[PDB]
């Protein structure tokens, strides 16, 4: 299917506590592959997926360099916004940015992205044309005028349409086993008596990748959608995900109930019932 590269940047001032801290993580699809933390032993760009390790010393230098200057410049950028909003240098502030590529299943660019938040609030976002911005307020209009007047504006866009797409396609090849084979959920239903006349049926989806999944409970034909407890999809800790859906049923009547599982790694949807044993 489609694929995405994303870099997530967090820059947090901590006045009186230290210098502003800068963290970058990178993702292909739902797999994190690089990490940088300006508080590290010696700040380096560091691998976090098998396939990124193929990259030579040339690579880890550029990315560490970019992140080292990111660390310097985002401290400057927090000061600007401190200035834009007329803020005390005593309070703590957060700047967040996301940006990257989307490519189709044949590897053609679909979309570029560049969005930033400041103290959790949307601040500036790149537009679909990748060559104009939308600003949440007059502070961000200042940033918009600087970014739009820059001699470099074309090279900003050229990154999203060029180098960003090239590395995404490369990564998707270096880790094509990893990144291009969806792992279907190992599925189970479990029975949990509540009283003498009510039991909880819990439908488990485990070890799946990517994270997108749908778990529906059906009493007979139709969906128990208002009586279904769903937890949020959650990381297993090993680059896969878990999720469960649960419903309370009349203690005698477990077979009226089916769990419907859809996931990219499943040929057709699954349907599970409670199999006592």
């Amino acid at each position: 299917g489609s694929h995405s590269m994303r870099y997530f940047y967090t820059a947090m001032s901590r006045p009186g506590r230290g210098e502003p801290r800068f963290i970058a993580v990178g993702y292909v699809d739902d797999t994190q592959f690089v990490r940088f933390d300006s508080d590290a032993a010696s700040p380096r760009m560091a691998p976090r997926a098998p396939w990124i390790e193929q990259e030579g010393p040339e690579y880890w230098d550029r990315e560490t360099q970019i992140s080292k200057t990111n660390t310097q410049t985002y401290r400057e950028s927090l000061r600007n916004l401190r200035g834009y909003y007329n803020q005390s240098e005593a309070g703590s502030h957060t700047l967040q940015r996301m940006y990257g590529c989307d490519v189709g299943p044949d590897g053609r660019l679909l979309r570029g992205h560049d969005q930033s938040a400041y103290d959790g609030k949307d601040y500036i976002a790149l537009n679909e044309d990748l060559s104009s911005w939308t600003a949440a307020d007059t502070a961000a209009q200042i940033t918009q005028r600087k970014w739009e007047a820059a001699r470099e504006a074309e090279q900003w866009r050229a990154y999203l349409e060029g180098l960003c797409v090239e590395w995404l396609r490369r990564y998707l090849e270096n880790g094509k086993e990893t990144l291009q084979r969806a792992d279907p959920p190992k599925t189970h239903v479990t029975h949990h008596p509540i009283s003498d006349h009510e039991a909880t049926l819990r439908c488990w989806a485990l070890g799946f990748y990517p994270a997108e999944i749908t778990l529906t409970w059906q009493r007979d034909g139709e969906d128990q959608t208002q009586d279904t407890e769903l937890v949020e999809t959650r990381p297993a800790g090993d680059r896969t995900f878990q999720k469960w859906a649960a419903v309370v049923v009349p203690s005698g009547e477990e077979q009226r109930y089916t769990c419907h599982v859809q996931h990219e790694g499943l040929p057709k949807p699954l349907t599970l019932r409670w199999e006592p044993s």
């Binding site: 870099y7 940047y9 970058a24 990178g26 690579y59 550029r62 990315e63 970019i66 992140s67 200057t69 990111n70 310097q72 410049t73 985002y74 400057e76 950028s77 600007n80 916004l81 700047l95 940015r97 940006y99 560049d114 930033s116 940033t143 600087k146 970014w147 820059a150 470099e152 090279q155 900003w156 990154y159 999203l160 180098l163 960003c164 590395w167």
Partner: peptide, 10 residues
């Protein structure tokens, strides 16, 4: 790979 231009100042 990161874009160096997104170190540009706000």
């Amino acid at each position: 790979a990161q874009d160096i231009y997104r170190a540009s100042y706000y």
